[PDB]
Amino acid sequence: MENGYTYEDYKNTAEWLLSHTKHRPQVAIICGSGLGGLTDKLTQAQIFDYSEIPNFPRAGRLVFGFLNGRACVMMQGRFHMYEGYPLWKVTFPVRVFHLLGVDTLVVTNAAGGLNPKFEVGDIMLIRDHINLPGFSGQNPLRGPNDERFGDRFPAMSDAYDRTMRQRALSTWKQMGEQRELQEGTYVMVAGPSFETVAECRVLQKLGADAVGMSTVPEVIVARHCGLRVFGFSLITNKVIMDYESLEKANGEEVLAAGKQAAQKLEQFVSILMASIPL
Amino acid sequence: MENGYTYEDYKNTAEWLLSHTKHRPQVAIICGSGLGGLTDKLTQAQIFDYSEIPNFPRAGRLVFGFLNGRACVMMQGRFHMYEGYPLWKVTFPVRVFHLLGVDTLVVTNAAGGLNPKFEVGDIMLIRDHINLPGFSGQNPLRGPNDERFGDRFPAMSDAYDRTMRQRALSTWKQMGEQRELQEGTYVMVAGPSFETVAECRVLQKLGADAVGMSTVPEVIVARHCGLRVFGFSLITNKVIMDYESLEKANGEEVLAAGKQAAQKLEQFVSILMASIPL
Amino acid sequence: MENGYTYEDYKNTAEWLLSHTKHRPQVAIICGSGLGGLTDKLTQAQIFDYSEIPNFPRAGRLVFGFLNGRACVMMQGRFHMYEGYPLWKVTFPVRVFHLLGVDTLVVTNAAGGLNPKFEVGDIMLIRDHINLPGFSGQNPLRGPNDERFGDRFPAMSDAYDRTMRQRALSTWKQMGEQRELQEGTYVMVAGPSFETVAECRVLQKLGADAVGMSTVPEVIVARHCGLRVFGFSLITNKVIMDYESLEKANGEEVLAAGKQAAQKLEQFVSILMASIPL
Ligand SMILES: O=c1[nH]cnc2c([C@@H]3N[C@H](CO)[C@@H](O)[C@H]3O)c[nH]c12
Ligand SMILES: O=c1[nH]cnc2c([C@@H]3N[C@H](CO)[C@@H](O)[C@H]3O)c[nH]c12
Ligand SMILES: O=c1[nH]cnc2c([C@@H]3N[C@H](CO)[C@@H](O)[C@H]3O)c[nH]c12
Structure with a gap:
């Protein structure tokens, strides 16, 4: 195996971006989906679609702006x-x-x-x-x-x-x-x-408290190159942990577990900004 | 990564089969190897080799017929x-x-x-x-x-x-x-x-009772597309769980663990058929 | 997936080697890096670079000779x-x-x-x-x-x-x-x-005593083809097992954990030779 991208492909994506927006971001935020109507809180919002972005994998958007x-x-x-x-x-x-x-x-x-x-x-x-x-x-x-x-x-x-x-x-x-x-x-x-x-039951035994399908790789890459990282999980579902219980995890309850619990999260993140040192 | 098959390749394998046998199966059975002389119990047995089968991975046979x-x-x-x-x-x-x-x-x-x-x-x-x-x-x-x-x-x-x-x-x-x-x-x-x-010892600690190298993927795919699933493991070997014990797992004892224990299994499956609702 | 090498590629690497050195080795040793200045202990040392070696993956050397x-x-x-x-x-x-x-x-x-x-x-x-x-x-x-x-x-x-x-x-x-x-x-x-x-904490719970990123695959392949295997881990670092502890694992302490602990290991291996039956 080998990474498809060369140091230069990164470098050319960055430059393209540096030149197409006057914004100069300091904090990157990687949201869920449902858990990020967080886009309106931004101001001076400039959007690029992933599709216009030299090299960007693949409706996916980079939004630049000012949170708090x-x-x-x-x-x-x-x-x-x-x-x-x-x-x-x-x-x-x-x-x-x-x-x-x-x-x-x-x-x-x-x-x-x-x-x-x-x-x-x-x-x-x-x-x-x-x-x-x-x-x-x-x-x-x-x-x-x-x-x-x-x-x-x-x-x-x-x-x-x-x-x-x-x-x-x-x-x-x-x-x-x-x-x-x-x-x-x-x-x-x-x-x-x-x-x-x-x-x-395996995952409870390993000592885990929450389970998902993302985040860890971005965190490892972030840390590899010196960023400061922190994050959150919105618990959208209690995972079924014994057999009588007839109820099930669905993509529907994860999505529809926006509501006041997701707005709570938006606002929390937005306040956090003030604790990030310049 | 990407799946090599398109919805259409499936569809064309199915049609080819629908047209080359008048049988219309309701129950799919996926046996071990040793644990399926189960082919004789069938009646009106029609065989296709995998090799004649549009798209079929790769001596491998699909046998259509009537179990009980x-x-x-x-x-x-x-x-x-x-x-x-x-x-x-x-x-x-x-x-x-x-x-x-x-x-x-x-x-x-x-x-x-x-x-x-x-x-x-x-x-x-x-x-x-x-x-x-x-x-x-x-x-x-x-x-x-x-x-x-x-x-x-x-x-x-x-x-x-x-x-x-x-x-x-x-x-x-x-x-x-x-x-x-x-x-x-x-x-x-x-x-x-x-x-x-x-x-x-790791696998006992995770809560597992039996161990093999198959089945799970077919079960996940089966469930993804709405089938009813059930299955069995013929325990062919007690896995060596401490160090003095000098005895070893081999492909020989797994295979040669057909015998009355495998016939038992054939007959069990064959009776089950009567519990599968039409 | 498929192995890139055919039985013949192996066979032709071996022959090439058999013909370019009169040495006929009986014991293969696969060292760390830091933990093998062990090359000087050899005598009649003949070196090949991996690069000259028909098929050899890819500064990497095969050294043939006599340990004890x-x-x-x-x-x-x-x-x-x-x-x-x-x-x-x-x-x-x-x-x-x-x-x-x-x-x-x-x-x-x-x-x-x-x-x-x-x-x-x-x-x-x-x-x-x-x-x-x-x-x-x-x-x-x-x-x-x-x-x-x-x-x-x-x-x-x-x-x-x-x-x-x-x-x-x-x-x-x-x-x-x-x-x-x-x-x-x-x-x-x-x-x-x-x-x-x-x-x-996961790995302690699984029953493991040491952790690394190598060895196991060579051992499995070795055993697949009938070799006798034994090995050692030089513990170069105690893995951080709770949260107050501010100290960290680095590639620097692993490398610089040569010293008397690595010389100890060289000499141990070199004596072992005498216990390997001809
Ligand atoms: O119980 C769960 N197990 C594994 N992943 C998820 C998730 C996350 N939500 C998405 C699936 O609804 C998926 O992208 C995953 O990262 C929510 N609940 C669970
Ligand atoms: O102790 C075991 N560990 C892992 N797999 C198997 C099996 C199953 N049998 C086959 C190997 O004999 C293999 O296809 C696997 O699915 C029998 N015993 C064991
Ligand atoms: O704490 C550890 N975790 C995982 N691997 C290693 C190693 C071994 N050393 C190398 C990295 O320093 C690497 O090749 C790995 O096999 C030393 N310490 C640790």
Whole structure:
């Protein structure tokens, strides 16, 4: 295997962007889908379709602008391993962002609650991840390493910025809420099918608190090239963890688990901006 | 990655079959190898070699006929990830079956007993699975989804039909047997080499009861497109679970673990037919 | 998928080698990198670069010679899944070795200690492995099997020769050392990034004692074709197993964890030679 992109392809995507928008983003935000009407909060919103973007994998848009005093770039729609993309395509935008000048990555996603304490609607702050595809070989850094981005063997034990995590628990308290900010381990599985009961039990045993099909690869790539990362999971569903229970996970409840729980998340992210140091 | 087949290739395999046999199967059966002399029980047996079959991966035969009052199609020999097939080839026949008109899938396989209660010879009824290749990306649905088959994000928490499971425990009692029908979680690993002792201990800890190298992908594809699924593992070997024990798993004992334990299985499947609703 | 090499490519690499060196090796040694200045201990050292070697994947050298009374072949630098090589390239030299006449494989590697009893510097003798890439499909034997090498379904429950393990604990006692020879399960993960804390906790729970990114595939291929295998991990780092700890795994401490701990290892291997039966 080999990454299709050369250092230069990245570099030429970045330049193209640098020249087609006067915005100079500092914070990249990678939202779910449902969990990002977050586009209206921006101001001076400039949109590019992925389709116009030299090299951009493949209705997918890059929106540049200003969230609450920070210059942002928001990916609206992301790529997934389950769509068939190799990981070096899934995480191509991350490297592009670094070269645009960005120094922080915020990632959000929807995920099934594995911890029996979580409730549909909860926001879980990501403290750590379990990269199960990565154990087998599906790590987005597989291949020759390019030292212009970062090291051969980057560390992930501190992927999720301790400072931003503290500031996120501050901010949340900064509005004394009906539920608290949750915290835990996000496990990535490839999907696109949902877990069996036995699989759920496997993931609870591994120590995971939430489960989804994304995020981890962008986080690894982000950290490889020196960005500060933090993120959240909107728990959209409690994963079925025993056999009598006749109820099921669907793409419908994940999507339709926008509502006040998703608006909550938008506003939370938008306030966070103020805790990101210039 | 991308599935090599288009909706049309399936469709043209099905039509070719619809026109070359007057049989109209309702139940697809996917047997092991050793565990399916089950071909003689059929009547009005019409055979096609895979080799004559427009598109069929690659001595492999589709046998059409009548098991105990049901119109069947029996795959004789299957494909495996360990032979090098991508999963979209392994599970191609499943989609073909759906379009032939089939509404039920019975899958059987040979597997090592992980549960220390099992004994060589036991039939384990499949209650659930742990799809370890699927955690990393080897899910046969990886790629663009085709809604003519089914949803983007199908559920697997109920893959193994509760009704058929109940009817299977009925039927077994319907002949008050020397051992009981076993029940549990089948875990798929890719192979083709057998597990170490430490690996066995891993799989026991995950909650698995039996282990093999097949089945799970056909089950996921079956469920993706609305079939009713049930299956069995003939436990052909107790997997070596500690270090003094000098005895070893071989392809010889799996094969030669036909005998009265495999005939038992044939007859069991053949009676089951009567519990499959028209 | 398919292995790029045919039985003949192996065969022609071997012959080329058989004819370009009068050495006839019996023991293949596959060292780390840092953990093999072991080249000077050899005598009658003949070097080939990988680059001159018909078919050899891709500064990489095969060194032929004599360790302590045994005819050796030492791979200096190896291939890794994380560099992008498929496993059938990573393990190509192993098959070549078998055809050179070799009957034993010694493998060594650097690995993070998962067992809280290990200490940086410790040598762990490999008693077993957990091949996590192999669970998902990344097994170097994936594809049609070639019976000239070995069986379709080889066993790995005895991969790590019990005799050589006993002789290794003898030999170590044969110099009554400040720490003892450690022993345990090596788990392979693909890398190239290092584990999170949560991942470490996963691997401790699976029963693993050390973790690295190599070895397992060569061992599986070695055993597939009948070689005797034994190996070691030099524990170069204690893997970070809880969150307050601010210290991190780096490629620098792994490399610079040569020193007296690596010389110890060289000398240990060099004495071992005397326990390998002719
Ligand atoms: O219970 C779950 N298991 C795995 N993934 C998801 C998700 C996320 N939502 C999407 C599927 O609805 C998918 O893109 C995935 O990342 C929500 N709930 C679950
Ligand atoms: O102990 C085992 N581990 C993994 N697979 C199998 C099998 C099944 N039998 C075949 C190998 O003998 C293979 O196709 C696999 O699906 C029997 N026993 C075991
Ligand atoms: O803590 C660890 N986790 C995973 N691999 C390694 C290694 C081994 N060392 C190399 C990276 O420094 C790499 O080739 C890997 O096989 C040392 N320590 C660790």
